[PDB]
């Protein structure tokens, strides 16, 4: 019995007859490129992505962020072409390229990347790490403005906090310095959120440092709603995520419900929901900066648990599911002598009545 | 007479687990003489071309593209002789894992 295909077949376009007049690809690399190009198309048959979680395929992501900078495309292209032509006119650069001795100003490259295409890379890595999957649950934004966060280890040691970095609680014990470019006419809010580490509620997250009404760049002169709290991850469950979110606001927002006390050592009060927070302050705040990093357990977490939080240190462990065993048979056939050991309660001889 | 030795029992070469069957690690999904079903995700390949699940989950069968090893000369030659629009397709067997890796349980509150 034959059935009609539910759509176009893959290789039904090219003509079977007169194969010698049809061009071929002689490169395994070319075939690999074509195969990977075809593998990403939404085929009508059961493919690998559908069974292994392409995450509901296409998703109309709600954009909550600042509009992109309006740049004159024609003049930008003209300037880029002129700069390329001026670089091409040089002969020393060509000599260096031929002689394979050429270097790149990585600092300037990083600065330009942050200025033009850093926001998109940061947004996609935050997708990959699931920041928007837990902060807004349906909304992604573009980190238009930069956000340089740095912890001070001492007098001459500075640890940066990049998108996805690993910073230990020993380095993160003190409040960090935040730098971003902004004129003296806007207001900003910085919020440090712990996505993982809440003992009771899985759908809730912690606040470590919330400062609101930041005039321009000056973060210290802005009023701090929640004082800084050093990270406290669990010993077993490690690599929690801590995200600094920077929001631009228009009006002078005052709130009495989200206000936190100076000690603020109560985890009941230190329970947050960024979804509800942005629902409350949706009219004015708009997220523009984001910087997230990973944090694991070290010796400094015990001090935070004991002296500050006044609790015992919880210790976890990655336990594995028990191995699967079939139903024990009365008369196992061709099974090894160790078959009885797979269902033994304990390795202790048990004498029933003797 | 002239035709001798034609008697030989069948080797039971076939497909064991179908789509939707819940299997465990080590279960032989299918056995074959020639490469009819190729292993995909979480399916190993024994030296006798048998397919066994490596993880515990649900068996699935998918039509996918075929990108052969560059060391396999015959497949490489076939690929280079393929026309510009031709892409090889094969049937792969996958196991979608259902059991999580583990859970973070509390040991001691010290």
């Amino acid at each position: 019995r034959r059935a009609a295909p539910l759509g176009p077949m893959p290789n039904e376009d090219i003509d079977v007859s007169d194969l010698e007049r049809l061009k071929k690809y002689r490169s395994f690399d070319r075939y690999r490129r074509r195969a990977e190009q075809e593998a990403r198309k939404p085929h009508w048959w059961r493919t690998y992505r559908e069974h292994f979680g392409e995450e509901s395929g296409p998703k109309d992501r709600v954009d909550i962020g600042l509009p992109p900078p309006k740049v004159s495309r024609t003049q930008q292209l003209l300037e880029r072409k002129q700069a390329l032509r001026e670089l091409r006119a040089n002969v020393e650069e060509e000599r260096a390229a031929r002689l394979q001795t050429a270097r790149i100003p990585l600092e300037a490259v990083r600065a330009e990347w942050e200025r033009t295409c850093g926001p998109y890379h940061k947004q996609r890595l935050a997708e990959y790490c699931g920041l928007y999957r837990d902060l807004f649950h349906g909304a992604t934004f573009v980190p238009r403005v930069p956000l340089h966060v740095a912890y001070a280890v001492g007098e001459d040691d500075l640890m940066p906090v990049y998108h996805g970095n690993e910073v230990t609680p020993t380095e993160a014990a003190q409040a960090p310095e935040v730098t971003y470019e902004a004129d003296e006419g806007s207001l900003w809010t910085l919020l440090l959120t712990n996505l993982d580490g809440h003992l009771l509620e899985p759908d809730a997250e912690y606040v470590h440092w919330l400062v609101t009404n930041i005039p321009g760049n000056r973060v210290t002169e802005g009023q701090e709603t929640c004082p800084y709290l050093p990270p406290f991850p669990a010993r077993g469950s490690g690599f929690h995520r801590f995200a600094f979110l920077l929001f631009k606001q228009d009006k002078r927002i005052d709130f009495s419900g989200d206000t936190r006390p100076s000690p603020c050592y109560q985890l009941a009060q230190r329970t947050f929901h960024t979804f509800d927070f942005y629902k409350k302050h949706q009219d004015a705040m708009t997220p523009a900066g984001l910087a997230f990093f990973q944090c694991r357990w070290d010796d400094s977490v015990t001090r935070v648990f004991h002296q500050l939080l006044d609790m015992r240190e919880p210790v976890f462990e990655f336990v594995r599911p028990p191995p699967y065993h079939p139903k024990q048979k009365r008369f196992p056939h061709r099974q090894p002598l160790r078959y009885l050991d797979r269902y033994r309660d304990s390795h202790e001889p048990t004498y029933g009545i003797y | 007479s002239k035709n001798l030795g034609g008697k030989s029992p069948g080797k039971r070469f076939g497909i064991k687990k179908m789509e939707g069957h819940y299997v465990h690690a080590g279960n032989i999904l299918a056995t074959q003489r020639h490469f009819r079903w190729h292993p995909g995700a979480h399916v190993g390949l024994g030296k006798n071309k048998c397919l066994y699940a490596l993880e515990e989950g649900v068996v699935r069968y998918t039509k996918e593209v075929y990108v052969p090893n560059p060391s396999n000369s015959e497949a490489v030659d076939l690929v280079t002789r393929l026309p510009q629009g031709a892409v090889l397709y094969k049937t792969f067997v996958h196991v979608v894992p259902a059991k999580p890796e583990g859970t973070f349980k509390l040991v001691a509150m010290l």
Binding site: R1, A4, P5, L19 | -
Partner: peptide
């Protein structure tokens, strides 16, 4: 399978033919 709509998706021997007046 033969009765499935996806029959002959792996057909490749018709794409290569490798077995004057």
């Amino acid at each position: 399978y033969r009765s499935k709509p996806t029959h002959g998706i792996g057909r490749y021997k018709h794409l290569v033919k490798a077995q004057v007046r």
